[PDB]
Amino acid sequence: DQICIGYHANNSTEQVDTIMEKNVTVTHAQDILEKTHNGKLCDLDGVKPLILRDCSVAGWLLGNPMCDEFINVPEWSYIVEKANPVNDLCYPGDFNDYEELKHLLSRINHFEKIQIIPKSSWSSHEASLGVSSACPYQGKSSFFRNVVWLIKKNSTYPTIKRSYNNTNQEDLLVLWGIHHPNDAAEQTKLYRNPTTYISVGTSTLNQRLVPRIATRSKVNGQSGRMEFFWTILKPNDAINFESNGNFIAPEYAYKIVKKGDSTIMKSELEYGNCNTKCQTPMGAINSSMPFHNIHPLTIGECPKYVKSNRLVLATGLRNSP
Amino acid sequence: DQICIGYHANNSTEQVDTIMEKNVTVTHAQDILEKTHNGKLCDLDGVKPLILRDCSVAGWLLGNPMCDEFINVPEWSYIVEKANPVNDLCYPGDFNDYEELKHLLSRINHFEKIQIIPKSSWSSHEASLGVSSACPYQGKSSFFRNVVWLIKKNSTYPTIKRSYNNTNQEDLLVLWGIHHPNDAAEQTKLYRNPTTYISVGTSTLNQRLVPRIATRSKVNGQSGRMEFFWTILKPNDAINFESNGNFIAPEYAYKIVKKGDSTIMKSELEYGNCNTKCQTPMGAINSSMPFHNIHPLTIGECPKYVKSNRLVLATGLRNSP
Amino acid sequence: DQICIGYHANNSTEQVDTIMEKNVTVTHAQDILEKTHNGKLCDLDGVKPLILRDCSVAGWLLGNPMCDEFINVPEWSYIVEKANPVNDLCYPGDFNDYEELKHLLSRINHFEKIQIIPKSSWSSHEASLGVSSACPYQGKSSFFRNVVWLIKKNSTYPTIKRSYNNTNQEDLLVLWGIHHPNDAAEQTKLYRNPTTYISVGTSTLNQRLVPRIATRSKVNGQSGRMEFFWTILKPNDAINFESNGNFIAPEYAYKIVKKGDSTIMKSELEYGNCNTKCQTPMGAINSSMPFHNIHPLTIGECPKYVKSNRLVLATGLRNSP
Amino acid sequence: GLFGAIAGFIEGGWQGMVDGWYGYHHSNEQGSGYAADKESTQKAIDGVTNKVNSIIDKMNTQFEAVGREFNNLERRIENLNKKMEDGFLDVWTYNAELLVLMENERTLDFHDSNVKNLYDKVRLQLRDNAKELGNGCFEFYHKCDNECMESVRNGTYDYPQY
Amino acid sequence: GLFGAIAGFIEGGWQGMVDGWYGYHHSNEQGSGYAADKESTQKAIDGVTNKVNSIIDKMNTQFEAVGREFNNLERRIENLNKKMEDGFLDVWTYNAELLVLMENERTLDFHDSNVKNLYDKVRLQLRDNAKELGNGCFEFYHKCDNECMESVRNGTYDYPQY
Amino acid sequence: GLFGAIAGFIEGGWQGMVDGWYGYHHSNEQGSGYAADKESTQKAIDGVTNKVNSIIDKMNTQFEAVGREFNNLERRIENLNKKMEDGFLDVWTYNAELLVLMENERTLDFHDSNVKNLYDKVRLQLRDNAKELGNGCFEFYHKCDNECMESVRNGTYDYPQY
Ligand SMILES: CC(=O)N[C@@H]1[C@@H](O[C@@H]2O[C@H](CO)[C@H](O)[C@H](O[C@]3(C(=O)O)C[C@H](O)[C@@H](NC(C)=O)[C@H]([C@H](O)[C@H](O)CO)O3)[C@H]2O)[C@H](O)[C@@H](CO)O[C@H]1O
Ligand SMILES: CC(=O)N[C@@H]1[C@@H](O[C@@H]2O[C@H](CO)[C@H](O)[C@H](O[C@]3(C(=O)O)C[C@H](O)[C@@H](NC(C)=O)[C@H]([C@H](O)[C@H](O)CO)O3)[C@H]2O)[C@H](O)[C@@H](CO)O[C@H]1O
Ligand SMILES: CC(=O)N[C@@H]1[C@@H](O[C@@H]2O[C@H](CO)[C@H](O)[C@H](O[C@]3(C(=O)O)C[C@H](O)[C@@H](NC(C)=O)[C@H]([C@H](O)[C@H](O)CO)O3)[C@H]2O)[C@H](O)[C@@H](CO)O[C@H]1O
Ligand SMILES: *[C@@H]1O[C@H](CO)[C@@H](O)[C@H](O[C@@H]2O[C@H](CO)[C@@H](O)[C@H](O)[C@H]2NC(C)=O)[C@H]1NC(C)=O
Ligand SMILES: *[C@@H]1O[C@H](CO)[C@@H](O)[C@H](O[C@@H]2O[C@H](CO)[C@@H](O)[C@H](O)[C@H]2NC(C)=O)[C@H]1NC(C)=O
Ligand SMILES: *[C@@H]1O[C@H](CO)[C@@H](O)[C@H](O[C@@H]2O[C@H](CO)[C@@H](O)[C@H](O)[C@H]2NC(C)=O)[C@H]1NC(C)=O
Ligand SMILES: *[C@H]1O[C@H](CO)[C@@H](O[C@@H]2O[C@H](CO)[C@@H](O)[C@H](O)[C@H]2NC(C)=O)[C@H](O)[C@H]1NC(C)=O
Ligand SMILES: *[C@H]1O[C@H](CO)[C@@H](O[C@@H]2O[C@H](CO)[C@@H](O)[C@H](O)[C@H]2NC(C)=O)[C@H](O)[C@H]1NC(C)=O
Ligand SMILES: *[C@H]1O[C@H](CO)[C@@H](O[C@@H]2O[C@H](CO)[C@@H](O)[C@H](O)[C@H]2NC(C)=O)[C@H](O)[C@H]1NC(C)=O
Ligand SMILES: *[C@@H]1O[C@H](CO)[C@@H](O)[C@H](O)[C@H]1NC(C)=O
Ligand SMILES: *[C@@H]1O[C@H](CO)[C@@H](O)[C@H](O)[C@H]1NC(C)=O
Ligand SMILES: *[C@@H]1O[C@H](CO)[C@@H](O)[C@H](O)[C@H]1NC(C)=O
């Protein structure tokens, strides 16, 4: 007669690593690393992302005519943007402090667009001839829908003096620009005045832009340039414009109704018609794991990202052969 | 007859955590986390901090008349500043490279103020009429005490040409500014000359400021603006001014006598009449612990900051019930 | 008769540390920290570094006449530069976005220099009188070899209008400058035109430089200043210059033939006539250790840097006295 | 293993003991079979369960990357940002892989310890009333029926009765 | 615990042993009492004291935050700086809490080990001259006075004499 | 040490055992000498070899500093960069020194464990046919020649034969 002490064994092939020994078979283990994803861009807790498709943030905000899809967009969860969107600045140029603006968007979930300076309002100057071949719509020369490219009316460009008061409660994003012509003959041809300026003032802002002339390579069939500037106009504060020419005036400005958690995701993927609690640029994650290894930049209630291919904890004991 | 082997037990209720078991009572333990502080701003090893109170660094250095308390301040250990000090730039404007200057102060323990361009010295121009309602003292219009707001004398503003040589051994902090008026009529009213400039030169510096005109919201009852610039003038080097108008000239400049360990603490607290070896924005720390959890930004011989609520080491053994 | 169980002992004096006990003698150990280096700057896998000696990157690229050694340099592995090289900008001034350029060099292993605007080419203007005492060669007044300091020819400075097309496949580094004179009398003396400008255009670039006049301390016997600018001209793109005066035009521009792993090492050491797989500013490393403690900034296949004085692993067991 | 039982003096585990991690196998006139030791098993389950939750919890606070963009003349701060975000990911990856490695080794040793302790508990009861075979088994000198077996599993095996 | 003694085969500690961590309790005709084992206790005190100083020292070099300010159009580098300083604080917090967790477990096991080793040292001396009760106690076959007890505590208990 | 053998009940090591880490010393009429235990020694060599490679490998991915320069009015981002690169070096230095400290302690304990287990393996074979001296040695009751010694080292020591 005998009694023995012993331990469990089973048909398990689960292996775990230790400091002294790799590939130790154990009776029980717990994988803690999510390795899979659905490969799609999805809504985040119901809330659809803003998928800019081929448009860039600049093309969207300034209102590139190829970006009509994104005129008055609803609340978003996150924004998606391609690495090299084709519909950026149709008319060649620069967007001043563009990254600092993009950073502001990472904290914004919704814009409401409103008109601050009506197009009809320009009685002294011409407002419906500010178009280009570089920036076409339905086969015709068009322009950034949110700003007005003003030019001389009957061979005269009188000094502009316009103000907008931010009466509404919400911070306002105001966008304007300046045109840089190719030569002195172009300057007079569009604006008459040879030496022009654009002065912009607010509580904080003290700007005075002047056109820089230079001969430049054609980009989208145009050698001229546009340089777009922006500000955030606080509540109950006014912005004051004044200019002799080269002024790309605001028509519409975006109102900041909702601020929250958001991000600008870089991804070539399109919408997937799904929902998720956790989204990455490569796809969405649905798991209760404490870790994943899909992509570092995520949004939502996510596991922690690590660079590992494998993380498995021993729960059971060394399994017998 | 028998002999037994056994171990210590006591009336201890001290608990410590382990990986496999939380709240294990032990006979002896050692807390290593300081959780308390006196809640006061104190001197650091005898040396009192500079408590700016309602003044900002800008208001202090430029010499806002509300900041007379901080005219010729003694050596400090650290500086304290409120989150939103009311006595900043009384006359609305900007302080150029302000943060880069603040960074320099984190390495400075003492300024000695000295006059480089006497107020009386301005024979060609008027120096006692450079005041404003935005920047009042004892009910009357005054101005930044360390700079002189020069204006035309008898309807003329001749070109200024002034130099200062840094003869003294210590690096010198020189402060000056430029005035931006509201319109062309204000420009002539104060300075006569319509197009003005301010050129500043040193060994390194090659500046040429010009006034930017724009119509701006009133801030502290004024729509004009001031833009303050600065430099560090090395030993045995000269700074050269030249201007047609809008020039806010230096009178006093700060001498950098002592450089050392310091910091600009953000805190709403006032002076506490205490002494300490270790100071935080929330209060001072007096302990021999290796860790604390009060606040990350500290100065002096301090324990290390962690985010923990509890760090207790087992020294003794599992205590019996 | 008896049989005993026991363990190895030897004459070893190797000690290792543990949490509970320091200086534990063991029979066997493995040092894993490299502490030594040859104290020399060496070639990296055959490929010699570019040792600028007393020249700076600026002095090299602009072509300071004291930096003739570094005219047409071969492919390098890494670059070495002193902390304070004496042969920087001979003619006093500034190098615009200099650090951003230095950063580009960390990704470059070879330049091929080529002429884009021949010196002879300047028929309308004088090109062989653009020299200074601050920037001497063989006892005579010379200048930055890669740019041409143009001045008036027979009391006239007609508007310059030059273009270069990047026909060659490789990105091109173009360098130019602007001269800032001391006064209005110097401006006319060199360039006749009182108000000048330099406009530079490419696909991306839209520049318009204007000379800033100010009275400045002499630096290397000169109060005037030069301000050097640069761009990367993409393939099949053209750069367009236009100027009334003060223009420091390109003659030679550097072609970017090879991009790879490189770095700008700060070191006072000179060439050592050695070879290595791993180089540091203090010397080179030849070891199979996983760690070293020589210097953080290294290049090549190196061990990992730590701040430790000692890292020794126990392999054997506690050795008997 | 550190404690010598699992894959040591006890060559291998038991496919036939399904209701626990550690336990007893008996052999007497009346038959044979496995019986899990509930107390030591449940104690081991709690230890490991807490370990896993402790690991998951400690790693709860950990660096999260945020998207930041920079223009063509901000290459230094772009690279700074790149090396910063990577630096943390490498630190946290290391932290995770090592913690797993270290605690895996401890978890296997923990099981070994539990088996050894259970073995020793039985050894201290039987004392001289059984022959210690050297393989995990104790061969009785007296005959031992199912009550006698159960009493060993109880902890109520009387030396004076035998 | 890993080594089976503390809260294992030795049910509980002794309120009555005040002058040490581990030791002996005796019972004979002449009386009873506790005696701490000085050697094993002091050895344990050194181990733990060094542990604590080693922990304190390793954490001596650790990230310290510095105040940095940024204007309204430097939001990216402000955020970079924020995430950088937080990242280190989270790494060092983790390092501190884990080190404590891991070494606490080791410290309790260390004490268990010291008790087990002390138990085994006595066990190897008494051998067959005493009955191993299974609870930490050895019941003598011969009568054992205070010298006889002291000799066990000495390490000078002669098997041949009894 | 945790397992009590090395510098515990076995006072010291053996200069005369050169061909292994753990082993046997015998004494009988025919002579005396050392014999390494090949199996337990090689097992220990593998464990430690893997440990070292595991340590080296885990530290393979680790922060590397890159040279970055900043002008005179970029002092904040220069300092940011300085504190960032130092922060990682301090984190990785800590990681390296601690890992060594912790695994050194484990490596010494590991050796102790191997000796204890080897001791216990022999103890379980000899059982009552030898007197357990309490110092690592077993004194035989029967006379034990070189075959008899070898059979203990074999694992083939028959209790029934003696
Ligand atoms: C009118 C015409 O057909 N001209 C032919 C020349 O082409 C024109 O070249 C000019 C300048 O050299 C412009 O690029 C013209 O393009 C536009 C554009 O952007 O599409 C035309 C727009 O109507 C005009 N819009 C406004 C509001 O002014 C726009 C702007 O002037 C410039 O962009 C400002 O920088 O320019 C282009 O059509 C052609 O070069 C020539 C043969 O060489 O033949 C001309 O008949
Ligand atoms: C003189 C007077 O009482 N004028 C009344 C107008 O008020 C004046 O409006 C002007 C410009 O519109 C200024 O703001 C005046 O304020 C001062 C100030 O800062 O206090 C007055 C100072 O003396 C003057 N100082 C100097 C050195 O010039 C200062 C500067 O000019 C400006 O700040 C430069 O930008 O301005 C203010 O008193 C009032 O607007 C009008 C009714 O609308 O009635 C006038 O009688
Ligand atoms: C011609 C001469 O000998 N003049 C004596 C004065 O010295 C001259 O002072 C001027 C301006 O005050 C310049 O610095 C002169 O230096 C040069 C230089 O850099 O070496 C001379 C160069 O030939 C000239 N080159 C060009 C292309 O113009 C250069 C430039 O003009 C300036 O650098 C542009 O800023 O200047 C220097 O020789 C002397 O000051 C005076 C006594 O005070 O006596 C004069 O005879
Ligand atoms: C428009 O913005 C101006 C500042 O440029 C702001 O002051 C106006 O608000 C009113 O200003 C009055 C003084 O001019 C002040 O008496 C009044 O309290 C204030 N109204 C409010 C609601 O704050 C703005 N115009 C409005 C609100 O019609
Ligand atoms: C004032 O600053 C000038 C530079 O702008 C500096 O050179 C002066 O110092 C003196 O300059 C002399 C040349 O002009 C030189 O011969 C003399 O050695 C030098 N003196 C010293 C002490 O360095 C400065 N003026 C002074 C010191 O009176
Ligand atoms: C010079 O650079 C111009 C742009 O400024 C570039 O377009 C030239 O290349 C050629 O341009 C032609 C149009 O003007 C085009 O028809 C042709 O395909 C193109 N050639 C190539 C090889 O791309 C450049 N000049 C050249 C290459 O001689
Ligand atoms: C554990 O098992 C033993 C033996 O099976 C139990 O002792 C028996 O208990 C039954 C039921 O109460 C009695 O009728 C018998 O007389 C006992 N037999 C013997 C041989 O002791 C014992 O009660 C159990 N103890 C536990 C679970 O603590
Ligand atoms: C430890 O204790 C034993 C017993 O108390 C000591 O042996 C006695 O020592 C005394 C004093 O020297 C002698 O007079 C007695 O004859 C001894 N009695 C017995 C029964 O041995 C012993 O010397 C001590 N050894 C130590 C502390 O190492
Ligand atoms: C280990 O050693 C024992 C004793 O030396 C071996 O037993 C002997 O084996 C030899 C050679 O085969 C025989 O001729 C003898 O008759 C045996 N003698 C005794 C006393 O047993 C045994 O075979 C070995 N076993 C191993 C290595 O597993
Ligand atoms: C462990 O197993 C993996 C996959 O099964 C294999 O690729 C690897 O080489 C093994 N590693 C070792 C150290 O045996
Ligand atoms: C441990 O004790 C604390 C405070 O005494 C209590 O709040 C906590 O819930 C306990 N934790 C566990 C896991 O028992
Ligand atoms: C260990 O040894 C070193 C050098 O041999 C010595 O300087 C140090 O003080 C010793 N440390 C301890 C804790 O004994």
Residue numbers in the entry:
A (entry chain A), B (entry chain A), C (entry chain A): 1 to 321
D (entry chain B), E (entry chain B), F (entry chain B): 1 to 162
Recite the paper's sentences.
However, it has been established for the H1 (1918), H2 (1957) and H3 (1968) pandemic viruses that a change in the binding specificity of the virus membrane glycoprotein, Haemagglutinin (HA), of avian viruses from a preference for α-2,3-linked sialo-saccharides (avian receptor) to a preference for α-2,6-linked sialo-saccharides (human receptor) is a prerequisite for efficient transmission of avian viruses to humans. However, surveillance of human H5 viruses has revealed a number of H5 mutants that show enhanced human receptor binding with HAs that contain other amino acid substitutions in the receptor binding sub-domain. None of the substituted residues in the mutants we have characterised make direct interactions with the receptors; they appear to have their effects by perturbing the biochemical properties of the receptor binding pocket.
Gln196Arg and Gly143Arg substitutions, located further away from the receptor binding site, modify receptor binding of the VN1194 HA in very similar ways. However, avidities for avian receptor are almost the same as those of wild-type VN1194. Thus, as with the Gly143Arg substitution, the Gln196Arg substitution is also likely to enhance receptor binding electrostatically, consistent with the observation that both substitutions increase the net-charge of HA by +1 and have similar enhancing effects in virus binding assays (compare Fig. 1c and g). Two of the substitutions Gly143Arg and Gln196Arg are distant from bound receptor. They appear to increase avidity for receptor electrostatically by the introduction of positive charge. These observations can be explained energetically, since the relatively weak effects of these mutations have a greater impact on interactions with low binding energies.
